[PDB]
Amino acid sequence: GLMQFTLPVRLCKEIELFHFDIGPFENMWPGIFVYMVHRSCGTSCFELEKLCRFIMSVKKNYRRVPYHNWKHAVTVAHCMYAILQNNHTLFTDLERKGLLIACLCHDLDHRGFSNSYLQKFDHPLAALYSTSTMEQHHFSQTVSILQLEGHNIFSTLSSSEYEQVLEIIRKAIIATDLALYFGNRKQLEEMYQTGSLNLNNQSHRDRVIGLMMTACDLCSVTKLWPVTKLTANDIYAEFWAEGDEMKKLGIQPIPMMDRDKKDEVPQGQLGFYNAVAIPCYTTLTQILPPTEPLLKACRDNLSQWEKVIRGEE
Ligand SMILES: O=C(NC1COC1)c1cc2[nH]c(-c3ccccc3)nc2cc1NC(=O)c1cc(C2CC2)c[nH]c1=O
Numbered sequence: 001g002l003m004q005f006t007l008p009v010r011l012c013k014e015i016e017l018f019h020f021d022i023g024p025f026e027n028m029w030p031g032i033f034v035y036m037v038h039r040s041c042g043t044s045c046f047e048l049e050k051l052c053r054f055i056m057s058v059k060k061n062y063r064r065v066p067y068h069n070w071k072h073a074v075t076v077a078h079c080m081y082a083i084l085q086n087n088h089t090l091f092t093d094l095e096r097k098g099l100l101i102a103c104l105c106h107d108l109d110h111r112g113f114s115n116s117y118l119q120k121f122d123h124p125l126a127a128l129y130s131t132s133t134m135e136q137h138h139f140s141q142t143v144s145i146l147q148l149e150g151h152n153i154f155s156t157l158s159s160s161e162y163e164q165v166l167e168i169i170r171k172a173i174i175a176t177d178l179a180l181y182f183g184n185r186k187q188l189e190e191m192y193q194t195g196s197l198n199l200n201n202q203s204h205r206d207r208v209i210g211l212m213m214t215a216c217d218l219c220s221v222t223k224l225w226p227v228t229k230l231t232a233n234d235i236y237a238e239f240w241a242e243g244d245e246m247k248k249l250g251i252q253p254i255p256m257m258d259r260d261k262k263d264e265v266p267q268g269q270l271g272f273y274n275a276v277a278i279p280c281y282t283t284l285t286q287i288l289p290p291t292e293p294l295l296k297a298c299r300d301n302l303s304q305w306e307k308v309i310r311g312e313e
């Protein structure tokens with residue numbers, strides 16, 4: 001009730017910044033998440049008994065994959081935390097609640113393979129969900145855990161508020177399907193520059209929350225260079241593994257996933273930053289100005305990758 005979580009000073013201070021790294025100590029991540037909830041939302045938003053129980057069941061349902069794991073779950077949620085804290089008059093009570101949970105759950109039960117690979121493998125999830133295959137699985141897993149005896153952190157909400165916060169969460173999680181992001185940022189670009197962007201339009205809020213989600217999901221390109229560079233090892237470990245499985249199906253993988261083209265990774269990072277990361281945080285800064293640090297950090301890392309190519313490291 002009047003029981004709040006504290007962090008060491010350095011963590012207390014650095015956690016408010018966008019570029020915070022949650023550290024190598026797995027056991028502090030749940031305290032870190034609860035801390036962000038109490039500060040983003042209130043000591044009252046969730047019952048501490050239930051939240052802790054939900055947090056730990058979620059953690060257990062992330063797999064020990066190189067990148068799409070429990071560390072990613074909490075990292076993406078922290079980015080959301082910082083976007084919300086730098087924009088706190090813009091979001092409803094319900095949006096603060098459901099967005100931080102959405103981020104923690106957004107990759108539940110990920111196996112480290114793309115929607116594309118499930119589809120070429122003919123995995124049963126590809127028959128159950130034709131588009132955004134993994135992302136619909138994630139939201140389904142989320143509802144699963146929410147219905148475990150003792151786990152419904154939303155029990156105090158009215159019938160109507162409950163239906164809203166699940167609908168926030170669901171759209172939020174589908175949004176992390178990067179295949180949808182390009183269309184969403186383009187509509188957001190037009191609306192912003194023709195002045196028709198209206199945050200009181202619910203369908204506009206949806207688009208904005210979507211972009212927030214892409215921004216949080218890719219936040220590893222907005223960390224300090226040594227974090228970004230080591231996170232890249234984890235992503236390619238998954239990519240190259242999936243490429244190995246593509247070869248096992250008798251398919252040449254895209255170079256992104258072919259581990260015989262390690263040498264061309266810096267150039268591949270360059271195009272990604274140009275085609276995705278920079279446009280994403282640009283458009284996000286245009287809508288939510290206090291999120292400028294993400295664009296500045298992304299740009300800085302773009303600059304580091306050009307240096308890697310030029311043989312300056
Ligand atoms: O454009 C890309 N992919 C999108 C387009 O539609 C999906 C892309 C293309 C890439 N070509 C290469 C590459 C080329 C030649 C030789 C070797 C490698 N490497 C890539 C990485 C990429 N992407 C990410 O590194 C990436 C990173 C992350 C998290 C860190 C934030 C999440 N998702 C990602 O896809």
Ligand SMILES: [Mg+2]
Binds near residue numbers: 106134
């Ligand atoms: Mg995902």
Ligand SMILES: [Zn+2]
Binds near residue numbers: 072106176217
């Ligand atoms: Zn993710």
